[PDB]
Structure formats: structure tokens, C-alpha cells
Amino acid sequence: PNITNLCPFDEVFNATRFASVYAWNRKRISNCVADYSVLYNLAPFFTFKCYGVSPTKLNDLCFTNVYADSFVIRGDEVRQIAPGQTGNIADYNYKLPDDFTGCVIAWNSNKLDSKVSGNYNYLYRLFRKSNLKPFERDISTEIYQAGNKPCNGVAGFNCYFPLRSYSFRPTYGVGHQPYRVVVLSFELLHAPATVCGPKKS
């Protein structure tokens, strides 16, 4: 039948400001029609690495809920947004499960997220006592104790503030330019699946 009520992917992808990778934004997508053909047909979105589902059959497979996790990382850490990868982002900032059903989308945003002085609004967690669970968000600013003496909240010797800033500048290489990443996770529940693509006449 005649289709309306598109899913708000414009509020996720074409947002003015994305969150940091340590405080990654999660937007749930429900009760709308989800046209993935828009995301495929845009040429600036360079990386469309989809795992556990084919990008061609996204328009036919219907799911219960769609999770759009949005954050900003560097160029070299785009590859860490993948199942089974390791590094600072995968261990401490954003962890993907190995049985991950969903696609990742990443694109360069040097024109938006970089300033000549340097952009300091984007932060990543450098030190955690334990590696993160999949889809876990850690927003704590508690002092990291690398030594034996208690830190007592003061970042002195062997006590570091766990969050470091990505100082994005428009003159950095491709591996250090800011990359905006949106991760779509598709889940199916016993509830009636209401996020589906359109049907042809």
C-alpha cells in the first residue's frame, strides 16, 4: 500500500553534533518504515561494513528494534568497530559482540569536526580496570589507579584522569581525521516486529 512515516535516520546521520565515543549515543528506532537504500546511495559514507546480514536484503528483512549508536573516533580506530577486534576503543570505549547482527557506517567529517585551534569536545577513555562488555557505556570520570597507593581523587603520580581528548585539526592525516560512526544493530523480539522496509505494488 501507499507508504509514509519514514524512520528518523535524518536525526541520526545528519545531526549537527555527535557524542563522544565514551558517552556514545544510543537511539532506538521503532514503529516506522526503515529505508536503508538512502544510506547505501550516499557516496561520502565511504565505509559500509555490514556483518551478519546482507546489505541488499536489509529492505526485506523486518526487525523488532533498530539501535543506532552514534559517536566520533579517529581514522585509524574505525577498524576497531568490528566483532573480535581490540584496542583502546574496543576494550575501553565501545565494544561490539562477536555474534553481531547489524552494520557499521563510518564517514570522514574533517570539514565539520575539526577546528584550526583544535577540537577538544571529543573524548575517549584511555584507561579502564577491565575491558568493556558488549554494548556497555562507561561515563565515569573516576581517577584511574595504575599503582598501589590510593588516588584519593587527585591525579598525581600513577593516578590519571581516564578520559583523553581527540584534538582534531583540519591538517591531520587520514588516520587522525575525525570519522563519524553510526552502528545499526538489528534485534528481533517476541513482540510484533514493526521496523520493516516498504513493500512494492
Binding site: 584507561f127 599503582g147 603520580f157 583523553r164 591538517t171 592525516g173 587520514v174 587522525h176
Partner: protein, 595 residues
């Protein structure tokens, strides 16, 4: 929980803060160097200050981790690089006096003006005029006046400065658990803790001696030939049995002999391989010169240039309104930013220099995956050696016929090969005894082997004994004749040029046997050979993480300096010099028979 994990976490936080602060410092130095304006000067000063203060406080926090309980070699190497006191180990008054001495040596060398008596209405500086009168003039007494006047004035104003400088640097090195400042400079080649690849600070001098002992016959023949040709230039002043007069070496100090190609040409009737006319006829602009160098580097298999390299590098002199430093420099700003500061003219020399600086940039690009404090050459020779091998391969007639600068009907006979090899020998073999002599004098004066009142007598004797160059007149200790050179006056290690010269031809033989070259070594090109590029990139990717002995074993399959590639490079020139030194006397006498 252990000390090593504390060191790893500390190094991670240091690496992040270091790369941001270093980037700001390098961007401000770049903005000063491409745009000489006083706000750029104060921006560079503020960023340099915040960088030096950052490393001061991070070395203070880094010396709380002892090294004897750290077993990982990379963490140990990063902490050894970070924990170096430098000049901070002294008292504040002595450190301030040392920086004052270094600054006033810099201002004396930069603003040293020496001119003719009885004509004081203007006078002539070293870099514009004295270099030209030393390299271009053919008059004996004019070169003698310039040489003696500059050394007399600069020596009398610099001798007590060097007198205090040697004592302050000796105290700095002995406070830093080194034997002397020469041991501190030899500590760059020190490798400790790796089995089989261990290299001591003390071993380098006999290694240099062991290489120079096989350098010495070839240099003697070259010296004899140069002496014969200077006999053609100066009829009565030079003796057949004696050394060369010092002010006839084409430079101010005798460091390079490349200004004698006009006087010492083997075959002047044969043309040179200068391709400047081909560039200007075909309108080769600087952008496409760097594009051709990039084509060479993707022919050998190395990655091409970044987009920010083409956007941000200033490859052309900007104009009269904006002043910039014209010195060719390759910049690794950090955060994947690589630039070349070069005011390119349309010449073959700037083409070869562009290949050299892009070799520098490729070396900087390859170790970008390394941690920040390991982002350097494995020793100080490797960084210039990997650029000079590109300058070697791009200068071959085969490569110039490949890229269209040289005609396919060009005849490469043996005479132009002999004169090309003699130009390369005056550039390369000529600087080796001067470099080894200067460093060995500096090593003994830091060691205290040379007494304080015996400096000039020892130095001139070694110049007679090693380099085979005699002074015009005797000089007493009111003079400081070493200190007239840029590197010794501004606290620079000088053995890097000797080691770079050896590593250059070692890398050239390793790449040319990798690329299956079937001729002599000086004809060889590494273009269109992916395996030679992979063999080289195995060393370029290491950076400072591995010992330089291990990096050398990765390239040439040897862990120590070898002089056999350099003499194998100059083998037909060696046979030619043996042929034409039959009538002349090879070798020199230490007597003052020329003057």
C-alpha cells in the same frame, strides 16, 4: 600492579599528550619557517617553551621508574629515551651559563663579519660572500686573506668560549654517568640488552678506525690526483711530496671537495649529465618534479603521498612580500601530517634534493605506527642515508632516460662515468677523513687526552697525518681553528656524516642485489623493483624500536659497519686513479714543504 604495567600506562598517557603538544610546536615552527613574521616568532617560542617544559616535567615523572626491573625492550627503550636529563642535571646557574655560552656561540657564528682592512664602510658576511670567495676564486693570496682573517677573528673571539664549553659539557656528561661528552655523543650508537646485537659506546671508535684504514688507500690516490690538478692550478706553491695547502680545498674548512670539479675534471671535453635544459624546455614545474619523485617511490613499492602533503607543503618560493626559510627541510609534524619546506628552482640539483627530502618523508611515514618516542631513525646515520640512496638512484642516466629528461640516444661511455664518479668522490670520499679527524679531535679533547695548551698543535698534526692538509702558517692557542665550522660551534654531533656515508652504500648494495642489477654499482636503479622496496621498508617500518644493528641486518645481512660497499662503488674510479698516479707520488709527508 607491577612496575612494568605502571610504565606502560605512564607511556600511554605520555604518548597522547606528547603527540598533541609536539603537533602544536611543529605547526608553530612551520608557520615561522614559511612566514617569517614576529607573531609567528613568538608563537614558535611559546610552543617550544610549552614543549620543553612538558618534557621536563614528564622526564621528572619518568625517572621514578627504575629500568633494571623492566624486561620488555620497547618499554625500556622508551623510558631510556624519556629519562635522559640533558642539561637539567647541573645546577641552575651552570645550566644557565651553558645556555648563555651556546647562544653566544650561535650569535658569533651567525653574525660573524670579517672584511678587508682600510675599507670599513661595509663588510662581508660568511654565508653570502665568504662561501662564494672560497668556492669560486682562483687567487692564492685572496683565499689566504679570507681564510686567515676569518679564522683569526673567529678563533680569538671563540677560544675562551670553547674553553668553558668543553668543561661544562664534560661536567654534564659525567653527571649523566658518561665518561666524557664524546661518550655522551657515542651513546646514540649504544645497544644494550639484546643478545648478539649488542653495541658498546667504546667500540665505535675502533670501528670507525677499522673502516678508515680501508678508506685510506682510495683517499690517498684521490688526494694525489687532486694535488696534481692543483699543481696545474697553482704552479709553485704546492709541493709534490707535501700536503695540500688548507685554503685551496674549495670550502672554508675543507669539508667538501666538490667545488674542485672545474679544476680537477678528468675529461673536460665530455659533457655532463645536467638535465636542467630539458626541464626548462619541457616546462617542468616544481609540482610535477615532486610528482615524478612520487612516481619513483610508487615504482619501488612505497606508499604514495598523502593528500595533506600536497595541500600543505609549500614547494615553491611564495614571493617577495612573504619571507620564508629557503633551506630544504622535510617536516614530520605528527598526527599523520607530513610536509616539505622547499623553495624549488627548476634544476637537476633541486630534483635530486626533492628525491632526498621525499626519502626523508617516506622514512618518517613508515614508522608512524611506532610509539612517539621511538619515531626516529635507529641511529643518526639512517635517516640521511635513506634519502641519499634515493638521490643516488635518481641521478643515474638510466633513470633520467626513463622519465624523459635524458635522450634515448645519449651515449654513456666510460669517460663520463669516470668524471661522474670523480664528482661523487669529491663530494663523498673527500669528506670522510675530515669528518673522522674532526670527531676524533673532539673525542680526545672531551676525553682529556689532548692537553689544554696543545690543541692547535695536535689538531694541525692530525690534519697533516689523517686528512693530508697542511696549514698555511702556524697557529698558537690564541686561535680556535676547529670552531670556525657550523657543527662544532653549535653543539652538533659530527660522526653522523661518516656513518651516513657508509650506510648509504651498504643500503645501495643491498637494494641493488635485491633488484637484480647486473652491472657496476654506480649505474644501478631501484626503480620498478617491488622486492627492493619491501626489503627497505622492513627497516623503515621499525623506526627506533629495534637496535640499529638489527635494522642493518634486516637490510644488508650484516650487523656492523662495512666499508666494502663504498670501495665497490668507487672501483672503476679507483682503477683509473691507480692508472694515472704512476708518475705522481701517492701519499703525503707531514713536513711543511708546500708552505
Amino acid at each position: 600492579s607491577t612496575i612494568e604495567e605502571q610504565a606502560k600506562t605512564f607511556l600511554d598517557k605520555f604518548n597522547h599528550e606528547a603527540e598533541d603538544l609536539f603537533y602544536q610546536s611543529s605547526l608553530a615552527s612551520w608557520n615561522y619557517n614559511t612566514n617569517i613574521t614576529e607573531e609567528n616568532v613568538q608563537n614558535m617560542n611559546n610552543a617550544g617553551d610549552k614543549w620543553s617544559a612538558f618534557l621536563k616535567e614528564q622526564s621528572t615523572l619518568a625517572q621514578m621508574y627504575p629500568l633494571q626491573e623492566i624486561q620488555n625492550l620497547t618499554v625500556k627503550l622508551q623510558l631510556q629515551a624519556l629519562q635522559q636529563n640533558g642539561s637539567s642535571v647541573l645546577s641552575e646557574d651552570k645550566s644557565k651559563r651553558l645556555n648563555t655560552i651556546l647562544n653566544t656561540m650561535s650569535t658569533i657564528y651567525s653574525t660573524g663579519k670579517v672584511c678587508n682592512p682600510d675599507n670599513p664602510q661595509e663588510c662581508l658576511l660568511l654565508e653570502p660572500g665568504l662561501n662564494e670567495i672560497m668556492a669560486n676564486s682562483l687567487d692564492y693570496n685572496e683565499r689566504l686573506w679570507a681564510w686567515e682573517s676569518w679564522r683569526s677573528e673567529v678563533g680569538k673571539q671563540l677560544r675562551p668560549l670553547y674553553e668553558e664549553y668543553v668543561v661544562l659539557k664534560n661536567e654534564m656528561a659525567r653527571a649523566n654517568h658518561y665518561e666524557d661528552y664524546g661518550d655522551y655523543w657515542r651513546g646514540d650508537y649504544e645497544v644494550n640488552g639484546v643478545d648478539g646485537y649488542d653495541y658498546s659506546r667504546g667500540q665505535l671508535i675502533e670501528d670507525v678506525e677499522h673502516t678508515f684504514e680501508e678508506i685510506k688507500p682510495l683517499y690517498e690516490h684521490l688526494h694525489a690526483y687532486v694535488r696534481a690538478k692543483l699543481m696545474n692550478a697553482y704552479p709553485s706553491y704546492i709541493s709534490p711530496i707535501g700536503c695540500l695547502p688548507a685554503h685551496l680545498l674549495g670550502d672554508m674548512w675543507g669539508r667538501f671537495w666538490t667545488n674542485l670539479y672545474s679544476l680537477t675534471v678528468p675529461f673536460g671535453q665530455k659533457p655532463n649529465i645536467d638535465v636542467t635544459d630539458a626541464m626548462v624546455d619541457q616546462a617542468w614545474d616544481a609540482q610535477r618534479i615532486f610528482k615524478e619523485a612520487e612516481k619513483f617511490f610508487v615504482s619501488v613499492g612505497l606508499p604514495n603521498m598523502t593528500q595533506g602533503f600536497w595541500e600543505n607543503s609549500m614547494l615553491t618560493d611564495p614571493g617577495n612580500v612573504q619571507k620564508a626559510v629557503c633551506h630544504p627541510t622535510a617536516w614530520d609534524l605528527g598526527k599523520g601530517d607530513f610536509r616539505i619546506l622547499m623553495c624549488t628552482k627548476v634544476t637537476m640539483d633541486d630534483f635530486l634534493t626533492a628525491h632526498h627530502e621525499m626519502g626523508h618523508i617516506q622514512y618518517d611515514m613508515a614508522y608512524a605506527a611506532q610509539p612517539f618516542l621511538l619515531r626516529n631513525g635507529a641511529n643518526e646515520g639512517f635517516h640521511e642515508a635513506v634519502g641519499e640512496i634515493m638521490s643516488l638512484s635518481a641521478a643515474t642516466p638510466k633513470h633520467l632516460k626513463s622519465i624523459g629528461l635524458l635522450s634515448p640516444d645519449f651515449q654513456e661511455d666510460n669517460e663520463t662515468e669516470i668524471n661522474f664518479l670523480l664528482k661523487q668522490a669529491l663530494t663523498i670520499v673527500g669528506t670522510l677523513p675530515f669528518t673522522y679527524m674532526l670527531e676524533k679531535w673532539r673525542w680526545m679533547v672531551f676525553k682529556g687526552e689532548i692537553p689544554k695548551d696543545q690543541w692547535m698543535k695536535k689538531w694541525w698534526e692530525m690534519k697533516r697525518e689523517i686528512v693530508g692538509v697542511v696549514e698555511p702558517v702556524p697557529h698558537d692557542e690564541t686561535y680556535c681553528d676547529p670552531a670556525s665550522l657550523f657543527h662544532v660551534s653549535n653543539d652538533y654531533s659530527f660522526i653522523r656524516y661518516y656513518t651516513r656515508t657508509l650506510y648509504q652504500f651498504q643500503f645501495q648494495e643491498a637494494l641493488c642485489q635485491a633488484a637484480k642489477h647486473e652491472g657496476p654499482l654506480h649505474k644501478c636503479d631501484i626503480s620498478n623493483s617491488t622486492e627492493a622496496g619491501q626489503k627497505l621498508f622492513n627497516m623503515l617500518r621499525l623506526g627506533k624500536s629495534e637496535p640499529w644493528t638489527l635494522a642493518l641486518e634486516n637490510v644488508v645481512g650484516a650487523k656492523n659497519m662495512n666499508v666494502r660497499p663504498l670501495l665497490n662503488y668507487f672501483e672503476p674510479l679507483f682503477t683509473w686513479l691507480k692508472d694515472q698516479n704512476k708518475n705522481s707520488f701517492v701519499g703525503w709527508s707531514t713536513d711543511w714543504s708546500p708552505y
